[PDB]
Design a protein around this ligand. Structure first.
Ligand code: ATP
Ligand code: MG
Lengths: 384, 51, 52
């Protein structure tokens, strides 16, 4: 707390920006200047009234093109050609003229709802060291993901190509998921995130087109980091066996090889893969130079858990009663998602009370519920 | 008189060129609207003075 | 804090956005004989295919 003054200060910078912006738009945006008036005039004189969306199939280098409209009929259209002869390419949306169809203009951009799944609006409210602990196997993910974006200068002293690629692997719950989302808050470059259960589809032929796409968008914006979460999901998830099966899975893998490195020479696509089925992947996937430093994660050790548990209980109410050290004693090489589920379930004990204090009793009780999960899908009791 | 001059006026009113239903996909800040006509495709077209 | 969230939305909304409809600065006159490609058709064409 005690940050009220700085938030008011930020707010105050916001008041001033909203104000001057608004008045500037209002009436002193003066379009009584001829370089505004005369440019729009004779621009609208060739520009429509109905603007007849078309789809450009291909161009001809005689100032013509063949469009196919979604309404139906094709047309062999001219081009007014103050629009830069060579700036438009197959797949463009073009403005045709309501009279003789000429390319009045060209729309710069258009998008799909299938790339909406890919792209993101988010801005995580967690930044790194809410991944506090495991703090030397995270120098392998911020020296080959973060750093060459931040400094290419270091890799120029040595020269040769800079890093490319990582595969994260280890036990589930050991932070793989949050590692990827934590470098993306630092770097502030286009963060794509795609689940591997959407790369597996119940329809064929569109599988490869999806996988081919991710990196083509990704190269198109000059920096991007593509998180493929769960590439362990490509051999264990499958729908029907007559449009899924071996075939679907083989093709998509094949596509990814060309995309990941292949012959495309696409833009920067730093890749992050989470997996714990690394032996269901190709040898041309886990091939070096697409994985450069690969990171192994195992369960923390006793003193590492102390780092983990203190991160989690800072958000909570505390007392002098609370003792973190004896919660550590009980657990023995377990995940940090287990530790994280004790602190989440400790406030569920406080919720149950409707008492806003968190005490050593609440942490020990949820410890027992957490250990109830581990050994009661077990039915041996003692190792038979 | 109110009655007979309402009929005579409705004869004009009923005569149309066709007036459609569209739906706005998105605007563009040239003061134009991309409208997908529900049966038909998309056309960027200007707007009236009442909107 | 809620005032911070509101004012960012308001600044963006009032400022407005822009989406280019391509032109070229090395062009400012095109309609001296652009209207011959326009308005007085010379002509754009329905594309077909020979079958016989
Ligand atoms: N080493 C750690 N340091 C700090 N926090 C941790 C650590 N390990 C786990 N956590 C906490 O536990 C969380 C739950 O982790 P997450 O769901 O990201 O784990 P995971 O390993 O990605 O799980 P899965 O095995 O299902 O893929 C994180 O969101 C994180 O805050
Ligand atoms: Mg995960």
């Amino acid at each position: 707390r005690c940050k009220l003054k700085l938030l008011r200060m930020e707010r105050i910078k916001d008041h001033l920006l909203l104000e001057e912006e608004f008045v500037s738009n209002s009436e002193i945006l003066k379009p009584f200047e001829k370089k505004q008036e005369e440019e729009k005039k004779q621009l609208e004189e060739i520009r429509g009234n109905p603007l007849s969306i078309g789809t450009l199939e291909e161009i001809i280098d005689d100032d013509h093109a063949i469009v196919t409209s979604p309404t139906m009929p094709d047309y062999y259209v001219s081009i007014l050609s103050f629009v830069d002869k060579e700036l438009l390419e197959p797949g463009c949306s073009v403005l045709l003229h309501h009279k003789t169809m000429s390319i009045v203009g060209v729309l710069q951009d258009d998008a799909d709802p299938m790339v909406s799944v890919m792209k993101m609006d988010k801005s995580p409210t967690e930044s790194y060291s809410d991944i506090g602990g495991l703090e030397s196997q995270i120098q392998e993910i911020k020296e080959s993901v973060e750093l060459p974006l931040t400094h290419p200068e270091l890799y120029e002293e040595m020269g040769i190509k800079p890093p490319k690629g990582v595969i994260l692997y280890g036990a589930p719950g050991t932070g793989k998921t949050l590692l990827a989302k934590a470098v993306a808050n630092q770097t502030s470059a286009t963060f794509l995130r795609i689940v591997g259960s959407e790369l597996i589809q119940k329809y064929l032929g569109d599988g490869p087109r999806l996988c081919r796409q991710i990196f083509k968008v990704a190269g198109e914006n000059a920096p991007s980091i593509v998180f493929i979460d769960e590439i362990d999901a490509i051999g264990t998830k499958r729908y029907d066996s007559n449009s899924g099966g071996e075939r679907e899975i083989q093709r998509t893998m094949l596509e990814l090889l060309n995309q990941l490195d292949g012959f495309d020479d696409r833009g920067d696509v730093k890749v992050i893969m989470a997996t714990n089925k690394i032996e269901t992947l190709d040898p041309a996937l886990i091939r070096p130079g697409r994985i450069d430093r690969k990171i192994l994660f195992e369960n923390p050790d006793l003193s590492t858990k102390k780092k983990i548990l203190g991160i989690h209980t800072s958000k909570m109410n505390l007392s002098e009663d609370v003792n973190l050290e004896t919660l550590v004693t009980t657990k023995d090489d377990l995940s940090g998602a287990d530790i994280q589920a004790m602190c989440t379930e400790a406030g569920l004990l406080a919720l149950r009370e409707r008492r806003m204090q968190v005490t050593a009793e609440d942490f020990k009780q949820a410890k027992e519920r957490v250990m109830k999960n581990k050994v009661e899908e077990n039915l041996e009791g003692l190792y038979l | 008189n109110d009655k007979v001059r309402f009929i005579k006026d409705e004869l004009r009113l009923l005569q149309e060129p066709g007036s459609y239903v569209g739906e706005v996909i998105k605007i563009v800040s040239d003061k134009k609207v991309l409208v997908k006509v529900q049966p038909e495709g998309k056309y960027i077209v200007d707007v009236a003075k009442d909107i | 804090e809620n005032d911070l969230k509101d004012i960012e939305a308001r600044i963006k909304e009032k400022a407005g956005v822009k989406e280019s409809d391509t032109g070229l600065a090395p062009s400012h006159l095109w309609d001296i004989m652009g209207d011959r490609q326009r308005l007085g058709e010379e002509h754009p064409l329905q594309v077909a295919r020979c079958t016989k």
